[PDB]
Point group: C3
Chain length 262, copies 3
Amino acid sequence: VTRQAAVVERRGNVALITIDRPDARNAVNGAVSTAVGDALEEAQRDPEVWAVVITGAGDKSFCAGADLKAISRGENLYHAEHPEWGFAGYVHHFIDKPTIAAVNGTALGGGSELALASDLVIACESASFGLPEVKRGLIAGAGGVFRIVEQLPRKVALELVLTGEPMTASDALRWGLINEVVPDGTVVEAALALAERITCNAPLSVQASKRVAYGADDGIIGAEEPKWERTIREFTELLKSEDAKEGPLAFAEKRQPVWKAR
Amino acid sequence: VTRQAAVVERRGNVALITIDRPDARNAVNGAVSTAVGDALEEAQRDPEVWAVVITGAGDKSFCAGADLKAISRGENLYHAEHPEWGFAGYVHHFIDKPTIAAVNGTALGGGSELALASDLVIACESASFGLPEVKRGLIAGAGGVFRIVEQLPRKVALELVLTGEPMTASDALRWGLINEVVPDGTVVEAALALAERITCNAPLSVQASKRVAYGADDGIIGAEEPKWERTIREFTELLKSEDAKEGPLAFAEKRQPVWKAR
Amino acid sequence: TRQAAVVERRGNVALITIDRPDARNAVNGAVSTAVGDALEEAQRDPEVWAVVITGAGDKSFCAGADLKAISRGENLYHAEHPEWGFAGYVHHFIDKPTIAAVNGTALGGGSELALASDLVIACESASFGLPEVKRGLIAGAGGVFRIVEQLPRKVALELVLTGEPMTASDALRWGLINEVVPDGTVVEAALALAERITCNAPLSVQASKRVAYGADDGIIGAEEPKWERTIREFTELLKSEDAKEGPLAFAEKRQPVWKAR
Ligand SMILES: [K+]
């Protein structure tokens, strides 16, 4: 349809990005990655933008992950100029400005990966997080596996990765994986309120603090680059497997998959 | 003395390893390390083994740590062919398959190190963890010191390390050090049920995710290698100290140790 | 004429007290020199098996850097050892375990002392935080990079980026600190924690500390680039107009007007 895949708007010193494909549960195709990647670069460049909020349209889904139809059309899913930014033009796209994921609904797979890549997270009551890629014969290749082990206690993170089972918003708050849980429908105002508790502070201070906290130098987190390389390497090999073909196919006939370990 | 030191059983796609020296509280000698190390390597090589559970015989002790009579006889406590696998053929023995410690009783010292080396942990209600070596004149030389600081909040890990005091299974659960606490006597069934929520997933996805989670390349966790070197160097220096003999002599003469800091 | 810190021995424990309660135990050159020396002495002395640090009184553990001393152009570091950093403490690894006995408010520099310590006991009315971002500055004494290691990442970044405080009770719940005790009783509590450590083999405890931090020859290799990054960022930030506006507005009890330069 003749509509923008994601929209951007200003609220004071805040750039609000809304993934706007609610019929597709806010799944990410190339159009989304273009719009979100461009929006982030613009937020980076504009000295008057002091914080960023990303959210999904509607109340059912924050981001369902990569768009399965787009994948089957063999479409490019990444920013066309900057594939190095990774999934949604977002996960490997460091900027100085603080980013807040306003999780308005289900956030499984790529959706959790967006939250993990963000600095701060507010989720609504009915939101949930997880990396169910292992149930599908792939892996969370947009940073999920190596970032979850850093953002949850190791044993709890490994349970989540290895079983592919979801975590409720309430449990994520309890673990310190997210910052706040709010009523469904209110996530954007809650995120803006959090942003305003940051944009009241000295912007160069907030931004310098963000770089120090991450160990970022010239827009690159040095310690993460080998994790990206390892992930890319593991993912590529995985795709050669028959199981990586079987897994998506089974979910596309609602039957259980038959794993061969090859 | 003449039973297999550790026993292996298949349960579906799960290999179940039981340390089987209940009379010695499942303390580890060369025979245990040989059996456990062999079983891990076989689980690695068998493409039909998709998860491993390790446990100890009976309801009193998961693992008492190093066999002290074996140590006093100057015996080799490691796997005879693979001393590099370290304590029990286990703690420095990375395999692609998810490992679950089914902690059936006390797990102080080496017992905690098996738990720390495993991917996931289920404990019985009366189980306890800790690294009491500091009370004797040595350190946790099987990876316990550097892994517990990664698996508990820093200040909480440091208290456990420096005091040598135990942590209950319920507290471990609350911190996210372990995954589940179950009634005494049911830990094996509970670990197998957890394993079933892993072996239902695509095995190559699960194993690739494990490698990415740990940053493992060709069976080595590069980041841990200098931590092992440091641990072994420190441990060696302590073995030679006067205080390292005062510790056990004081526990034998049923008095308080008088430390000399040499 | 007065002494700024008090150093004493209790059994095998060295007890250090910042003693400027009228300045809310803010750190100047005299504090850093005395605190640095005491740590070095605790390191050298084989009978010192643990260290406790506290502030006098019940209002303030440590208010941070002394703003008068700064405005007077004074040196705030140990006179011989700038490399030890804030209070002679935050970049000064020793083999002996250290316990921060947080006797009251501990924002800014005070939270950095807690973060640099091995263990922390706080009174009920204590609070932690890094409000530097509200002043046009940053927590350049290790606070930003250590807080993200010692609290869950999302929770740490909230603290860092909002500059809002955290109560003793929430710090305990997260495992940032080890114990919360009634006001006025932090020193007895810190010494009791210390006695649960000095009962253990001193060489074991100290080797365990080294392994736990990855310290070789008194240096935590992994933290050096983080120090360098912090110093580089701090240095550049001081050149901005906002870095002057922040402390000026605070001194003038008004809201700062940020220019983002
Ligand atoms: K040991």
